Structures are given as structure tokens and as C-alpha cells.
Amino acid sequence: NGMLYPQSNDSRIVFPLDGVWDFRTAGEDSYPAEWADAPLPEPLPMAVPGSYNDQNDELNLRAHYGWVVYQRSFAVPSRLVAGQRMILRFDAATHAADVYLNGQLLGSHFGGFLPFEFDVTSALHAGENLLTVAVDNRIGSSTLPVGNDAGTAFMGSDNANVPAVAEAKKHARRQNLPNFDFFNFAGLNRHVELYTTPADAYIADIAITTERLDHIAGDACTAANALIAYDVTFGGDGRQVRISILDGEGTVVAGVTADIERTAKASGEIAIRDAKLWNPGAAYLYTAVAELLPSRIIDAYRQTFGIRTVEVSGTTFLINGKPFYFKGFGKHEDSYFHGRGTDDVLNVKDVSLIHWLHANSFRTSHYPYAESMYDLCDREGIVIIDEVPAVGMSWLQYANPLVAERHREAIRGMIARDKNHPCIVMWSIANEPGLDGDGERPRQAYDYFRPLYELAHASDPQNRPVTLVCCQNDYTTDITERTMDVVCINRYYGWYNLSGDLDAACHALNIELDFWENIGKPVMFTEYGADTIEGIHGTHGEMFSEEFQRDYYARINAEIDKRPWFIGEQLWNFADFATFQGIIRVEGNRKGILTRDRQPKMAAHWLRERWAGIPDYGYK
């Protein structure tokens, strides 16, 4: 269950397999398996970590449907692998992968945004090893994220009543028809690495939780006492593990030796006096060092963590007992050449931009992000809402067992991967699923999503709040959204409806706000905004002008400022990003307050000014 990021120390080594690989496109629903037995014939180069779609302009890989095959060779010293447990880890293969080492099928995986790994101890041999990875990009009614089995993509245009169109449609080249509004970037989007652990016994998982805070200071910089819990899982086979708590300076401030009881596991509590707390805008990180004892040390892992509590109370969102207000946006892992490929230069820059904007939070729309981004936000005091790739769901999916299991897999996998991050304060179990309507549809939606709500609570040892990001819908027939711990709504009053009319937009918004006021839950925006082409200007800003985006946020935010129970503003989007092509997508989605090259539109400056005057704690 545990998926700790590979670590190098005295008992463990990591050997990265990133770089320029060999690559071939394959079939719509098959690939030659014998490609795993020998070097790929006439291979293309493909850098990895990264989407393959924008890495070859001779081909149109954005149009590709089905399989591609990655391959590379590697060799490591035999003396290093000797006596060790050898693990091959893929941080992300989008969406599904078959993995071969030296002609042996290691196995397969479907989750496109969460890591998976194989024990290759027996599959490895000395000298060059041949690693072949088939990657499947196909989406459909049974995938998460959801694809359409026929018809059009989102916000796709059609003239279905024209006989010639209907006929041509049946012979059209097969394409992925996304059930979501971002491009279906595929491939080895994140790192690949071989790593080592001891074979006989090893640390397999670590969970650190903040259990209680005693006498929190007025500024929440400290608590007189913090009670934290540890849970270390072991693999392999009166054994003991030593746990040391290291502060920001490397000083051991607490330590305990715990017994390993048998799934071998050691668990307990540690009291830390005058603990320095993790807050938005003021991060502080400890390290929990776990050492498996035989004075010598058998295995070790260093787990970063932060000491803080999260509690929804009435209409407030309390971090360390302080009423927090979200300032931020939905993001995407999206950039010009990498596509969905992870880029830590871009992560560092983006985090700096979040600081520049005086934002304090974002959501991982619409899939778990690269792990490094969470580490970065841990050390930079930026709060995260962590979201699974459950986007594009409707009633067709709720009756599908394979979908349900993949959804459960995504939730359990995300939380297993990300549980230790202090920056994460809430889980999102879906984005914009069908929840409303008449007949039994709302009840079917509820019956589908509640056990997933409960699962997220059961899987998270910190028991953070759980939400579901709700599309603009009939809130009166939706019976699911109101039952989340925090109500997270996507609303586009004045854009997709009442278009360009901000007075009417604010009126409508206020009507729905009056509804939510009676619901009595804490409520936040997780999306709202307007497509905006930088350089389009007007003295009276119309849709697509910079002025209109600015005016839009000014009016809307002026309205939500009147509601004490409205605890956050996350807009759409942080930055322009790539989508499936269509008549409403001007070189992708342009609701970014920044361009795709991270340059500030007028709205970004305005929002920066507003957010500079809004405190993380006590705004409402």
C-alpha cells in the first residue's frame, strides 16, 4: 500500500532511468509484444519524463489513438544489486502501461497519474538490461478521466441533423473523445527510477499525523505541546525501530524506540514541547527519521512532515484553530513542450508566482500532481486541495463496477501517496460529476459518491475534510454537494450564462448564495473566470478582453465578500493551458490569469493587489 518516494542513504540507492529513450507509435488497440525481446526497430527519440504528444512535429502525435512503446537499456554494478531488493518505479504512465524487463512481462497498471512499481530482483541480470514500456492513451466510458465512446468532445460543436455529417461521422478517424476540458497528454509523464532496499527486512511505509495541539500561541507559530503519531510498516521475513524527530536545524528534539509487532508494523505517539507549527505563509518542517535496528543500522527512511491541525467547524475552516481563507486557483500540469510532463523548473517558478500573487492555495485539478510539487509547497507554505482524476463522470459511470473500482483505487492511491504532506488540507473525490436532475438520478449520484466520501475519510490517518467539486448545476435538485465537509463550487455566472452582463451575473450569484447561506456549510469557489486573450483591450471591457476578466473578478469578489460563511476564492485558471481543439478554445483554455508562458494579464495585477490586503487568518 505504501508508496514512499525512493530515497538514497546508507542502506538504499536510487538509480534514475530518465533521459532520451527509444520510442515507436503502435496500433489503435494493439502493439507488437516481440518488441520487448529486442531493440525497437527504427526508433524515434523521446525524452522522459514528459508527454510524447508535443515531442515530434513531423508526426501529429496529438492525434494518436491507442498504443505507443518506450524502450531503453541500462546497466548497474552487480556489487550494488547483490543481496538487495530491487524495485522498478514509474512515477506516472498515462494512462495505462504494460511493463517488460528483458522480455518478461512484469505486469500492468491503469492509473495515469499515480505511481506504481515492480519487484525486479529476479528479472534483473548483469550487463545491459532491456526495458520496454507500452503506454495506452485511450479514454472512454470506463476510464478515469472519462472519455466518450462516440460523438463529440466538450463543448464540441455539431450539426447532427445533417445526413452527410452523420454519415461521415461513422467513417471518421478514431480519436479519443475526452470527458474533460484539458488535452489528453499521454506517455511517461513523470520520472522512472530503479531503487534499492535491504531484502530481509525493510521500511515499506510511514505515516505521521498531528493528533493534538495544546495551548496554541496567538500567532499559531507554536503550541506548548503537540502530540503526533507514527505508523511504520515493514516488509520482509523482538525487532525494533528507532524514531527520531529532527527540527528545522537537524536537532533531535524527540526520540523513541518502538517494538515491531506482527504485516509487521510499529506505531505510537510522541510528545513535542513548544512545537513549531506549519502554517500557510509560514511553513515549518520536521523530519521523522525511522531506523530499523538489528549500534549499526539495517534500514532507514527520512520522512518530512509538518505539525498542524485541520478542522471544519460550522462555517469555518480552521488551521491550527485559526479561521483560514483560501486565496488561489485551480492549476494544471501543463506547459509548451512537456505537456503534462513534470518540470521542476516550472514548479519552482509557479510557486514563486503564487507568492508574487499573494495567493496561499491551489487545487490539483484534475489529477494528482507530481510528488515534488507537494514537497515544494510543504517547504513554501502553500496549501493544497488534492484531487483524483474523477472528472467527466455521469450516470453511465455510476453503474460501472470497473469505474467504481478504479475510482476507489485512485482515492486510496492518492491518499496513500500524499498523506504525510502538511500542505494538503482537503481531499477532492471528483470534479464536476452529474449530480442533479429529476427522477432517481440525484439519489443514484448520492449513492455512488457517499461511500467514496467515507473511503477518503477512512484512508486518511489525519482525517482531513473531504469535498467534491461541483459543476454549475441545479443546486435545488443536487442532493450530494451539500453533504460534503466543504462545499466547493464552480460557477460561471456572466460567462457561460447571462453573458457579459455583470449586474445580472451578480444578481444570480446572490440568489444561489442565499440558497447556500441556508445550507449552513462552509462554501468556496473552486472555479470561476473568463477566457481572456492578452492584448485584447477595450475602454468598456467585453468578453475576451483583459478589462473584462478584471471587471469580472472585481464584481464577483465584491459579492462574496458580503458572505461570512464564504471561506475561499479559487479561480479558474492559474495559467492558460492546452485543450482538445474546438470553437470555444482559442489555442486552448484562456481563462488563465497568467498566459501559458506565465505572464500576468491585467486581472493578475488586480488580484495581486486584492490578495495582498487579505490575510490567511481572520479575514472572516
Q: Which residues are catalytic?
A: 432, 527
Rounded to the nearest whole angstrom, what is the least distance from the CB of residue 514 to a copy of itself in the complex?
9
483 DSSP assignment = G
Interface with ligand CKX, residue 179, by CB under 6 A: no
560, 569 contact by CB (below 8 A): yes
For residue 109, which amino acid is it?
A: H
Choosing among ligand CKX, a copy of itself, none, which partner's interface includes residue 171 (Cβ < 5 to 8 Å by kind)?
Answer: a copy of itself
| Minimum distance from residue 115 beta carbon to ligand CKX (Å) | 23
591 binds, among a copy of itself, ligand CKX, none (CB under 5 to 8 A by kind): ligand CKX
* Residue 284 touches which member of a copy of itself, ligand CKX, none, C-beta under 5-8 Å by kind: none
Site of grid cell 524502450: 71
In this structure, the number of other CB atoms found within 10 A of the CB of residue 383 comes to 28
Q: Compare residues 300 and 471 and give the one whose CB is closer to ligand CKX.
A: 471
Query: What is the distance between the alpha carbons of residues 552 and 369, in angstroms, rounded to a whole number?
Result: 29
432 binds, among a copy of itself, ligand CKX, none (CB under 5 to 8 A by kind): ligand CKX
Residue 609 makes contact with a copy of itself by CB under 8 A: no
Q: Which of 485, 486, 512, 488 is nearest to 498 (CA)?
A: 512
Burial of 21: CB neighbours in 10 Å, binned 0-12, 13-18, 19+: buried
Q: Rounded to the nearest 10 degrees, how much is the dihedral formed by the CA atoms of 430, 434, 440, 442? A: 60
- Residue 546, amino acid: E
The residue from 471, 484, 567, 607 that contacts ligand CKX (CB under 6 A) is 471
Q: Which is nearer to ligand CKX, 491 or 598 (CB)?
A: 491
C-alpha cell at 531: 477566457
- The one of ligand CKX, a copy of itself, none whose footprint includes residue 261, by CB under 5 to 8 A per kind, is none
Check binding of 481 to ligand CKX (CB under 6 A): no
Joined together, the cell numbers standing for residue 367 give: 489529477
Separation between Cα atoms, residue 117 and residue 106, nearest integer Å: 9
CA–CA distance from 29 to each of 49, 68, 112, 183, 447 (Å)?
24, 10, 17, 20, 34
Is 337 one of the binding residues for a copy of itself (CB under 8 A)? no
* Cα–Cα nearest to 235, from 121, 129, 156: 121
d(CA 155, CA 181): 8
Q: Tell the smallest beta-carbon distance from residue 549 to ligand CKX (Å).
A: 12
The answer to whether 432 contacts ligand CKX (rule: CB under 6 A) is yes
Contact range with ligand CKX by CB under 6 A, out of 40-48, 179-187, 287-295, 352-360: 179-187
Residue 540 touches which of ligand CKX, a copy of itself, none (Cβ within 5-8 Å per kind): a copy of itself
Counting contacts by CB under 6 A, is residue 213 touching ligand CKX? no
Q: Which is nearer to ligand CKX, 317 or 492 (CB)?
A: 492
Residue 168 parent element (H or E): helix 163-169
Give residues in contact with ligand CKX (CB under 6 A): 180-182, 366, 432, 471, 490, 492, 527, 572, 589, 591
Give residues in contact with a copy of itself (CB under 8 A): 57, 60, 62-63, 152-153, 156-165, 167-169, 171-173, 175, 472-476, 492-493, 495-501, 503-505, 507-509, 511-512, 515, 531, 533, 536, 539-540, 542-545, 581-587
